[PDB]
Ligand binder design. Structure first.
Ligand SMILES: N[C@H]1Cc2ccccc2[C@@H]1NC(=O)C(=O)Nc1ccc(Cl)c(F)c1
Ligand SMILES: *[C@@H]1O[C@H](CO)[C@@H](O)[C@H](O)[C@H]1NC(C)=O
Ligand SMILES: *[C@@H]1O[C@H](CO)[C@@H](O)[C@H](O)[C@H]1NC(C)=O
Ligand SMILES: *[C@@H]1O[C@H](CO)[C@@H](O)[C@H](O)[C@H]1NC(C)=O
Ligand SMILES: *[C@@H]1O[C@H](CO)[C@@H](O)[C@H](O)[C@H]1NC(C)=O
Ligand SMILES: *[C@@H]1O[C@H](CO)[C@@H](O)[C@H](O)[C@H]1NC(C)=O
Ligand SMILES: *[C@@H]1O[C@H](CO)[C@@H](O)[C@H](O)[C@H]1NC(C)=O
Ligand SMILES: *[C@@H]1O[C@H](CO)[C@@H](O)[C@H](O)[C@H]1NC(C)=O
Ligand SMILES: *[C@@H]1O[C@H](CO)[C@@H](O)[C@H](O)[C@H]1NC(C)=O
Ligand SMILES: *[C@@H]1O[C@H](CO)[C@@H](O)[C@H](O)[C@H]1NC(C)=O
Ligand SMILES: *[C@@H]1O[C@H](CO)[C@@H](O)[C@H](O)[C@H]1NC(C)=O
Ligand SMILES: *[C@@H]1O[C@H](CO)[C@@H](O)[C@H](O)[C@H]1NC(C)=O
Length: 339
């Protein structure tokens, strides 16, 4: 017998104590080693309600990632709350590692195993575990990178699809690689991303067909973001410690719904901090080839308002609330207290 509850979680990882990489350093001192032989108990004839949009596990992961970044990525100038902080900003080794979230004694994590689970409501196939799977704390906008994939069909997630103000998470069932490079020996901040146009357009077509099932077969159209901060209008992510900002106009191309798609990118030093603490200037990029190859496993979308009297629904890449990144992985878990 159990009940929904919140508690202080701890983390586990396979971090190396001899690594200088920042995620490894953080996890070495903030996490315990993983369980080599984890146990999972599949519950019989149980019905449990989940709500990925109201899950304290997400807030806790957010706090960890903020703590990790604050200790690891030092901007040269911090501009928070009228106070100016000038400090050293050394170049670091940066590459996210999987982090597991675990319950203390008296508590357990319930895991929804329904294959078409959208993140909210009842789940028929539930199991109990002591820890989540390994989740990489990848901070990005527009595109979700290096995450887990949906096992069967593409999944559409939203707290309220009818409310256009609520972010939509698209969960892909097949990854598409994105190849981003700041080339070696000149604009040191000029970069680009390469994506297989055949693979991407095929996946995007499948996404449109899924959205149709949720929007009464209305016509599905993609458009570039209307405006706002660069972190929202562009695909932003961190590669090897460097902040990349990529133009995704070519990705969301209704005409294509075949060759290599090349997105123009820029490395930015002056960014709006995702932690919500104003603006910051980070150090200029390292020398040589800067390269990151990632799997696109999800998409964050915002739906246009004012389309009720038309047969079209318009979707634009967006997000920015990094908590949604954690929701895309934590959706199937909830903490309960054993009475
Ligand atoms: N004011 C913040 C907090 C918040 C809350 C809800 C909605 C939007 C936002 C804004 N988001 C951002 O500013 C932000 O995500 N920046 C950023 C920076 C670097 C990288 Cl790599 C990256 F992915 C992202
Ligand atoms: C529930 O579990 C059974 C047995 O594995 C499986 O056949 C069925 O597809 C599951 N139901 C859902 C909704 O995934
Ligand atoms: C990239 O995608 C492939 C195919 O799903 C997967 O095998 C691989 O683990 C992914 N790489 C990651 C997680 O960075
Ligand atoms: C992905 O999901 C779609 C339905 O959303 C399905 O038609 C397609 O077969 C799936 N792709 C793979 C590789 O399983
Ligand atoms: C998820 O499923 C529940 C019913 O199980 C439904 O109420 C809700 O609208 C669904 N959410 C989405 C985004 O389809
Ligand atoms: C979903 O959003 C619509 C549009 O704002 C709103 O009318 C409705 O009350 C919302 N539904 C729920 C479950 O709150
Ligand atoms: C990434 O793109 C570069 C060319 O820009 C290529 O040399 C490299 O092989 C690509 N990486 C992968 C994994 O395809
Ligand atoms: C692009 O993707 C297709 C499958 O959609 C694949 O057959 C082809 O080899 C890819 N092109 C390149 C340049 O790798
Ligand atoms: C979408 O169209 C198909 C016709 O192939 C129909 O079976 C289905 O009911 C429609 N879905 C909605 C929700 O409009
Ligand atoms: C992306 O590129 C297109 C085509 O050059 C351009 O019109 C658009 O303004 C760019 N978007 C941003 C956010 O810079
Ligand atoms: C979308 O695809 C068409 C194919 O002809 C192309 O002409 C157009 O430039 C594309 N839009 C972009 C690259 O933003
Ligand atoms: C995604 O995972 C691959 C393989 O570990 C890594 O090389 C790449 O840098 C990752 N991408 C991001 C944005 O962290």
């Amino acid at each position: 017998v159990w009940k929904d509850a919140d508690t202080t979680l701890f983390c586990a990882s396979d971090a190396k104590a001899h690594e200088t990489e920042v995620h490894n350093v953080w996890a070495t001192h903030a996490c315990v080693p993983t369980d080599p032989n984890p146990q999972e108990i599949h519950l019989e004839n149980v019905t449990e309600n989940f709500n990925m949009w109201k899950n304290n596990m997400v807030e806790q992961m957010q706090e960890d990632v903020i703590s990790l970044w604050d200790q690891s990525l030092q901007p040269c100038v911090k501009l928070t709350g009228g106070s100016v902080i000038k400090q050293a900003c050394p170049k670091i080794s940066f590459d996210p590692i999987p982090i597991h979230y675990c319950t203390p004694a008296g508590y357990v994590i319930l895991k929804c195993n329904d294959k078409n689970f959208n993140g909210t409501g009842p789940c028929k196939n539930v199991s109990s575990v002591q820890c989540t799977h390994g989740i990489k704390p990848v901070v990005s906008t527009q595109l979700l990178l290096n995450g887990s994939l949906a096992e069967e069909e593409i999944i559409i997630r939203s707290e309220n699809l009818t409310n256009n103000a609520k972010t939509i998470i698209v969960h892909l069932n097949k990854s598409v690689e994105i190849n981003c490079t700041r080339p070696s020996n000149g604009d040191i901040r000029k970069a680009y991303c390469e994506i297989n146009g055949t693979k991407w357009n095929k996946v995007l077509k499948q996404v449109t067909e899924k959205l149709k099932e949720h929007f009464n077969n209305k016509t599905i159209i993609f458009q570039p973001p209307s405006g706002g901060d660069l972190e929202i209008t562009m695909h932003s992510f961190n590669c090897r410690g460097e902040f990349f900002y990529c133009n995704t106009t070519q990705l969301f191309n209704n005409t294509c719904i075949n060759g290599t798609i090349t997105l123009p990118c820029k490395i930015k030093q002056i960014i709006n901090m995702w932690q919500g603490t104003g603006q910051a200037m980070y150090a200029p990029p390292i020398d040589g080839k800067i390269n990151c190859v990632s799997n696109i496993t999800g998409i964050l979308l915002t739906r246009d308002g004012g389309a009720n009297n038309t047969s079209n629904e318009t979707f634009r890449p967006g997000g920015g609330n990094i908590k949604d990144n954690w929701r895309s992985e934590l959706y199937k878990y909830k903490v309960v207290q054993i009475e």
